[PDB]
Write a protein that binds this ligand. Structure first.
Ligand code: WD6
Ligand code: WD6
Ligand code: CA
Ligand code: CA
Ligand code: NA
Lengths: 301, 301
């Protein structure tokens, strides 16, 4: 029993993290087989960063401009290329610790684990959700750029995120491992804003089910609502509308607890309209929305 | 910027986790050099578990009763002994992935990372505090016994916890790696209760400093209180009394923010007496007490 913010074990990713240096810019890279992946803005000076033309800047680079370090052992760069916003540096050594992996782009509301790194050295691991406005609320300091987010699925690492930047509001933006940004952001040092965020409704419901599984029941009630009538309360509290597709993935938690999804929605409706009145659910005093139905099942079953 | 529940990278510990089987009992063990550490109650049957005499039960065991598996490769047990509540199984192979390590017992209010494992296979990582009543509020299912908690300090793993049991209230109890229980618990399948818990005051203050560092300031005020006068409000809200020793370790965060500790205590006093009035601090709607001053500095500096 118990319910915690839980990350995947990070070791398979720790063995892939390297330090990539270009000029006086140093960030993290991801070493899989004989290719190192890192944010392309490593090739930028502080002056280049204000308004870079990356095709120009890369064309003016050669392999010997890129210092790669796996621990202390320097890696020799034998080629380089650009994949949208990520730089690919070919090296003369395949990473012997390369796990089975995939590059997958995730959806808003899905979660992943972040291995925060500095100078190619892993420092901490935590869980994140991709917000509906395509930012993540991470924990990142200078030098973390190049850190990756991932899920693990039967010894296969699915890389879904590489960290590129902190926005002025302190939230974080990056790309998938094909270098395609999440959200309407670009890799240049200009003040960019995210769209307005919303609460991930399906995840809050998943977490209410986790609470019931763990014996928290005070928020339950005998009522029910319709899928249509609930969405009217979602709009008012800046929650995502609920889909029959969402209900069906909540199916398993609905079965294990005996609480129909629309029954739980009436509980969420009451929680939204009345607040918690000082009580907690799974040790929290607000409605948590960064646990997916999968996260809940993985931890409660 | 940002502030997250953050664990240590788990890879150094993942390479030490094995499966230990005795009879029909299977749990996790920790393989360092040529010794495997696991909870001694692995030698118990379900009938033995109600009221075990462990010296008897171990004396009736031999090496070939203990099946150890590191992945698929079985480890041959060449000796066994008891260290209080942990069983030591000597094996014929030193773990090639053995990190630099120490066995350290922690204090109530300190934090560590938990690598939750099942059948010797790591499944998730999260952060825990040792509660003042010597339990932890973990996330653990059947088969997790033997999972370890740890901190990492310059490539040295300090093991401080091995998981032995879930109490009837759903909180978790275990030992240090010398097999000495945290708190007034024993390893037998009987209903045991923890003492009444209290809030870790120094940690709440650390977290208020983290919030200020991250730009959350609404709870601040111009007031101040005395060390003595604050403890009177601590007693009323079931908070630990504050020590000058606590203040001095909060020194660095007090300096970096310019907020004297007793100034922050007046803010905590007001938060305790008035509540949050619907507002959040670092994304939480209650006062978090599972971040130490060290945790805050590590993540904010
Ligand atoms: C709350 C608050 C205040 N917020 C900040 O002070 C962070 C500021 C915000 C900003 C954004 C744009 C701008 F015009 C001016 C300021 N942004 C950074 O400093 C970015 C600058 C940057 C570098 C490259 C590209 Cl492609 C894109 C960008 Cl926008 N630097 C990093 O993100 C680093 N690599 C990693 C890093 C450094 C320092 C602090 C955090 C992190 C992280 N994580
Ligand atoms: C909320 C709620 C309900 N709470 C429970 O149902 C857990 C129950 C509580 C209990 C405690 C004592 C008792 F008389 C009767 C019941 N306790 C377990 O089941 C313990 C039994 C046990 C095994 C050995 C020793 Cl030395 C000590 C103990 Cl008390 N089993 C584990 O802890 C397993 N290894 C790991 C495990 C199994 C199942 C569920 C969680 C976990 C964990 N983590
Ligand atoms: Ca209901
Ligand atoms: Ca004050
Ligand atoms: Na974590």
């Amino acid at each position: 029993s118990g319910f915690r913010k839980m990350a995947f074990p990070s070791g398979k990713v720790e063995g892939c993290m390297v330090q990539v240096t270009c000029g006086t810019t140093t960030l993290n890279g991801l070493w899989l087989d004989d290719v190192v992946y890192c944010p392309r803005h490593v090739i930028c000076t502080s002056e280049d960063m204000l308004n870079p033309n990356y095709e120009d800047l890369l064309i003016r680079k050669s392999n010997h401009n890129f210092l790669v370090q796996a621990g202390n052992v320097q890696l020799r760069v034998i080629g380089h290329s650009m994949q949208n916003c990520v730089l690919k540096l070919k090296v003369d050594t395949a990473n012997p610790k390369t796990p089975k992996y995939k590059f997958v782009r995730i959806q808003p509301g899905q979660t992943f684990s972040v291995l925060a790194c500095y100078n190619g050295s892993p420092s901490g691991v935590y869980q994140c959700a991709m917000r509906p406005n395509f930012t993540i609320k991470g924990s990142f300091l200078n030098g973390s750029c190049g850190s990756v987010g991932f899920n693990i699925d039967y010894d296969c690492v699915s890389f879904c995120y590489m960290h590129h930047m902190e926005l002025p509001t302190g939230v974080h933006a990056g790309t998938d491992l094909e270098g395609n940004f999440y959200g309407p952001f670009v890799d240049r040092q200009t003040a960019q804003a995210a769209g307005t965020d919303t609460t991930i409704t399906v995840n809050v419901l998943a977490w209410l089910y986790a609470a019931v599984i763990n014996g928290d029941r005070w928020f339950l009630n005998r009522f029910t609502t319709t899928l249509n009538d609930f969405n009217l309360v979602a709009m008012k509290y800046n929650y995502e509308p609920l889909t029959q597709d969402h209900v069906d993935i909540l199916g398993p938690l609905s079965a294990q607890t005996g609480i129909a999804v629309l029954d739980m929605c009436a509980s969420l409706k009451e929680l939204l309209q009345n607040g918690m009145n000082g009580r907690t659910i799974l040790g929290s005093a607000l409605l948590e929305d960064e646990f997916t139905p999968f996260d809940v099942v993985r931890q409660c079953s």
